[PDB]
């Protein structure tokens, strides 16, 4: 896809973490760890080095990881993640 991205469907449950840690890298949001025993490991859908470009149609480039956390805390259901694999 655009910038070589892929579309991934990620389930988000209120008060349950997705099970991945994220960091800012310049103007990007990058997945840094897939937490062992968490939901993201179980689904196999997110990976270290993945760049998050969009979450449910919201552009993520340039956003602080704190805003990403806040955004996700306000969402539940099946979310559309647009990712660039590493």
């Amino acid at each position: 896809g655009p910038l070589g991205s892929k579309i991934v469907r990620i389930e988000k449950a209120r008060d349950i973490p997705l099970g991945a840690t994220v960091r800012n890298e310049m103007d990007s949001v990058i997945i840094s760890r897939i937490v062992k025993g968490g939901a993201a490991e179980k689904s196999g859908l997110l990976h270290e080095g993945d760049e998050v470009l969009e979450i449910n149609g919201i552009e993520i480039r340039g956003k602080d990881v704190n805003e990403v956390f806040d955004l996700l805390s306000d969402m539940h259901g099946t979310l559309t993640f647009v990712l660039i694999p590493s």
Partner: peptide, 4 residues
């Protein structure tokens, strides 16, 4: 880093 930040857990989501």
């Amino acid at each position: 880093d930040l857990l989501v």
